[PDB]
Amino acid sequence: KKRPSVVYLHNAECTGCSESVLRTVDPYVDELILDVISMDYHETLMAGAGHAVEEALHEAIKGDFVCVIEGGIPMGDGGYWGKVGGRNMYDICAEVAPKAKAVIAIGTCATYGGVQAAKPNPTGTVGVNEALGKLGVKAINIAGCPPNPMNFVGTVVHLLTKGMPELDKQGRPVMFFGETVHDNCPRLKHFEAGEFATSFGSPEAKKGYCLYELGCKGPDTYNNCPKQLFNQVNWPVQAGHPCIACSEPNFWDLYSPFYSA
Amino acid sequence: NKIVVDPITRIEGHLRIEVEVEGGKIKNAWSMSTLFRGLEMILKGRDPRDAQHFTQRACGVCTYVHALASVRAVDNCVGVKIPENATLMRNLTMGAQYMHDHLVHFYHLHALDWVNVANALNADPAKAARLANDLSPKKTTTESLKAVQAKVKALVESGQLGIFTNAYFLGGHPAYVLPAEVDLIATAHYLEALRVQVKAARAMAIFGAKNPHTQFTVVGGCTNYDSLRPERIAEFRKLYKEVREFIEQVYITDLLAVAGFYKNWAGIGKTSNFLTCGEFPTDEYDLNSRYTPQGVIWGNDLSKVDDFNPDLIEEHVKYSWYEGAGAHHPYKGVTKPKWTEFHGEDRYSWMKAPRYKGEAFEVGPLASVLVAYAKKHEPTVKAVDLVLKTLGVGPEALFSTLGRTAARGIQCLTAAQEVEVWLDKLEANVKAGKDDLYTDWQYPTESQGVGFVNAPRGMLSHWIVQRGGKIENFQLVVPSTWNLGPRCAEGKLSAVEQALIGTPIADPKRPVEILRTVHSYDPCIACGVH
Numbered sequence: 001k002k003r004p005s006v007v008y009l010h011n012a013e014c015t016g017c018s019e020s021v022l023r024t025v026d027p028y029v030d031e032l033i034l035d036v037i038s039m040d041y042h043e044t045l046m047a048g049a050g051h052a053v054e055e056a057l058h059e060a061i062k063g064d065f066v067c068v069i070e071g072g073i074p075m076g077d078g079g080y081w082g083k084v085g086g087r088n089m090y091d092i093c094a095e096v097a098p099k100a101k102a103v104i105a106i107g108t109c110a111t112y113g114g115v116q117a118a119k120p121n122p123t124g125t126v127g128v129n130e131a132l133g134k135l136g137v138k139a140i141n142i143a144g145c146p147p148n149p150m151n152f153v154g155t156v157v158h159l160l161t162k163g164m165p166e167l168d169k170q171g172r173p174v175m176f177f178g179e180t181v182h183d184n185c186p187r188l189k190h191f192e193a194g195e196f197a198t199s200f201g202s203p204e205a206k207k208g209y210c211l212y213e214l215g216c217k218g219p220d221t222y223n224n225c226p227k228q229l230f231n232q233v234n235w236p237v238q239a240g241h242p243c244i245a246c247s248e249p250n251f252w253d254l255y256s257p258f259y260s261a
Numbered sequence: 262n263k264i265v266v267d268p269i270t271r272i273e274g275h276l277r278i279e280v281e282v283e284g285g286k287i288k289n290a291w292s293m294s295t296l297f298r299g300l301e302m303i304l305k306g307r308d309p310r311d312a313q314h315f316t317q318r319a320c321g322v323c324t325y326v327h328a329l330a331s332v333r334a335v336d337n338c339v340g341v342k343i344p345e346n347a348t349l350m351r352n353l354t355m356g357a358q359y360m361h362d363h364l365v366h367f368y369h370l371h372a373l374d375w376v377n378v379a380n381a382l383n384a385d386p387a388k389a390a391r392l393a394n395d396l397s398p399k400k401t402t403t404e405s406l407k408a409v410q411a412k413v414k415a416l417v418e419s420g421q422l423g424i425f426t427n428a429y430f431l432g433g434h435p436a437y438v439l440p441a442e443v444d445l446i447a448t449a450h451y452l453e454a455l456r457v458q459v460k461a462a463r464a465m466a467i468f469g470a471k472n473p474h475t476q477f478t479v480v481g482g483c484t485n486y487d488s489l490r491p492e493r494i495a496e497f498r499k500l501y502k503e504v505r506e507f508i509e510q511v512y513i514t515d516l517l518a519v520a521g522f523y524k525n526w527a528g529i530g531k532t533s534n535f536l537t538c539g540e541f542p543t544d545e546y547d548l549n550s551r552y553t554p555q556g557v558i559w560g561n562d563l564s565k566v567d568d569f570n571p572d573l574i575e576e577h578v579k580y581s582w583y584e585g586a587g588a589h590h591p592y593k594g595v596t597k598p599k600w601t602e603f604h605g606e607d608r609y610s611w612m613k614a615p616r617y618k619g620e621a622f623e624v625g626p627l628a629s630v631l632v633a634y635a636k637k638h639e640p641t642v643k644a645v646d647l648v649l650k651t652l653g654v655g656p657e658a659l660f661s662t663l664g665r666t667a668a669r670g671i672q673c674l675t676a677a678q679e680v681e682v683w684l685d686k687l688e689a690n691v692k693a694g695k696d697d698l699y700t701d702w703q704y705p706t707e708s709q710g711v712g713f714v715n716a717p718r719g720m721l722s723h724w725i726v727q728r729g730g731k732i733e734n735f736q737l738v739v740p741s742t743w744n745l746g747p748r749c750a751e752g753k754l755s756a757v758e759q760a761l762i763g764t765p766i767a768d769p770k771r772p773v774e775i776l777r778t779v780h781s782y783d784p785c786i787a788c789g790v791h
């Protein structure tokens with residue numbers, strides 16, 4: 001029918017990737033769901049439950065759709081760690097993803113593995129392209145934990161209006177992830193001036209100096225936080241907390257301990 | 262015969278419900294949590310200062326609450342006394358989290374089990390607007406209502422129903438009884454709540470940096486000096502008032518109205534044993550300095566409220582996918598996942614089974630509201646009365662699925678009422694020049710600490726054991742672990758399983774009566790299992 005069809009899968013996730021979505025503005029989620037796309041399968045918002053919803057996913061995948069995958073895919077010991085309907089998450093994805101016109105990995109968990117993939121990765125979770133790359137899935141990676149609503153919706157609409165966005169080697173659309181947070185950070189003035197906070201309760205902290213010494217991973221993170229803001233109102237560094245590199249592969253291990261450079 | 266609902270939709274995470282019916286009534290029940298992430302295993306040996314960032318990710322719906330319980334558990338195990346402004350700011354952020362959480366649950370997660378959206382198409386908009394106008398002080402027009410009806414029509418007419426595909430009310434359902442005119446007021450409010458939720462989240466982001474997943478808290482206090490500006494408090498204050506008004510004038514009024522056509526649910530899904538740790542302290546080291554009180558109700562006896570004793574908590578694994586059958590207090594918790602398949606060795610859940618002094622308990626808005634009310638918390642007492650008075654029932658109507666649902670409405674407003682108090686103080690302190698948000702701290706050689714949070718879904722506690730500034734043990738015991746966990750070693754039914762027994766099922770092929778009960782608990786499977 002009319003509006004392009006979207007099938008939204010939930011794997012090893014926290015659901016913060018779907019709540020980020022509900023935060024979209026211009027368009028609001030109502031305009032999105034009723035005028036831009038057809039949300040055919042979405043566990044969190046569905047009216048019917050049990051088999052009524054599985055019959056829906058089943059018929060939607062017979063058509064032309066875009067697949068949205070939230071969460072990492074558990075693969076250790078066979079992947080029984082994550083089940084929907086009694087079926088392992090990897091089995092559902094292996095079936096759905098390859099029939100889609102495009103696959104979009106939402107959240108650092110779907111893109112790279114995420115929180116459950118930090119050491120020692122009890123469940124063997126992996127991102128989408130690592131799990132399904134061999135079934136031919138090449139997903140667009142919208143990184144962040146969670147990503148800015150703008151980067152996911154702006155990619156859906158792009159995909160639907162202009163085509164496939166140019167990606168970086170990490171799979172992220174360069175239009176949103178092409179510059180580091182540091183390059184757009186307003187505390188850059190302090191940085192350039194050689195003015196740093198070495199403690200949270202100090203006068204420098206109160207003056208909004210650079211958090212580099214306090215572990216800001218801004219110089220290493222690709223995201224558009226400073227320029228887009230979150231909730232149209234704030235971002236970590238503005239709230240005086242350093243950037244934790246939440247849009248980067250393996251941040252959990254690579255960038256922790258968080259409060260030390 | 263059995264009825265299995267998998268997936269249960271309109272919840273957070275992966276849940277499967279299996280029930281045994283006999284004479285049209287649920288006779289047995291099993292709550293099956295089907296995803297394991299293993300956050301406590303990942304924490305092992307890390308820096309306690311990192312915990313908060315990992316734990317926060319146990320759930321993005323009840324975002325922030327785990328950051329708080331973690332920073333409270335490390336604050337406690339290091340003996341730090343955070344400044345008053347960090348206490349106020351942590352409280353405002355939680356207040357805003359209740360405002361948001363509750364509103365989204367009622368309308369986008371729960372409404373659809375009581376409301377037939379398709380019937381709204383059969384309402385007379387002028388008659389719907391008149392009724393709406395007799396329910397609250399907010400003026401409604403036909404035209405706005407006619408407009409929502411045109412939206413629904415435009416959608417139905419496209420053939421792409423989206424999230425209404427196979428809804429249980431499609432083509433009528435015997436368990437769905439509201440007039441088409443209430444179905445249209447409720448549909449107009451559901452779309453409206455989608456826009457208010459955006460404002461509630463933005464308000465939280467004023468103190469929290471962002472929503473979902475705040476980033477302004479540290480062990481020792483808070484980091485947000487920027488928001489201490491009059492401009493930023495004014496901003497927050499404006500959004501806060503818009504949202505507050507909507508809960509008082511639309512959420513509450515709609516809640517009582519729908520509940521009014523389903524009074525038989527005031528006798529369905531009953532429980533005994535309620536507990537809370539309270540929330541919103543003045544003294545971070547005193548459960549009794551909390552706005553909403555702490556306490557333990559046994560059975561359904563509101564005349565005797567005991568003292569909450571955390572030493573009485575043990576988590577079971579006899580029917581969960583973990584090694585053996587030992588129950589442990591959280592400081593001595595173990596997380597060794599051992600899968601044995603669905604009902605393999607009768608184990609049926611990735612959730613542990615928390616028991617209090619060996620008994621099964623219910624945590625959440627109902628539990629919280631019953632403790633406050635029994636302890637005579639005025640805000641609470643004035644609010645419970647309004648409700649019973651409005652439904653023309655007594656407090657005994659509170660022990661049910663209906664009660665579990667009105668209590669969330671009550672908890673959402675009392676929190677909302679108090680946000681004004683903390684703001685005001687925060688603001689006066691900044692005006693007087695008192696602007697500190699952080700306290701320095703050092704680690705003891707070896708220490709243990711606990712963080713008690715009363716999240717929107719009930720009692721949350723993070724337990725840490727550190728040695729050398731390295732985590733030896735980190736255990737989370739979440740409200741949904743209490744409500745939705747499997748049976749314990751003594752084979753006792755968790756609160757959801759027990760609430761299920763006796764539920765009548767009209768159409769077993771479309772068993773919304775199980776959803777009404779399961780949803781009243783606001784399950785969060787990501788939180789319950791972590």
Ligand code: SF4
Pocket residue numbers: 012013014015016017070071106107108109110114115144145146318321
């Ligand atoms: S990327 Fe972060 S917010 Fe998204 S599902 Fe994973 S843990 Fe949650």
Ligand code: SF4
Pocket residue numbers: 181182183185186187188189191209210211212216217218219237242243
């Ligand atoms: S606060 Fe972080 S992102 Fe901003 S200038 Fe300093 S290091 Fe760069």
Ligand code: FCO
Pocket residue numbers: 320323326327716717718719721739740741742784785788789
């Ligand atoms: N609320 C919330 Fe989430 C749950 N259960 C926790 O804490």
Ligand code: F3S
Pocket residue numbers: 144145181221223225235236237242243244245246247
């Ligand atoms: S933590 Fe994530 S939200 Fe932006 S500021 Fe850093 S990339």
Ligand SMILES: [Mg+2]
Pocket residue numbers: 301613736737738739790791
């Ligand atoms: Mg636990």
Ligand code: NI
Pocket residue numbers: 273319320321322323324785787788
């Ligand atoms: Ni949760």
Ligand SMILES: [O]
Pocket residue numbers: 273320322323718785788
């Ligand atoms: O939650």
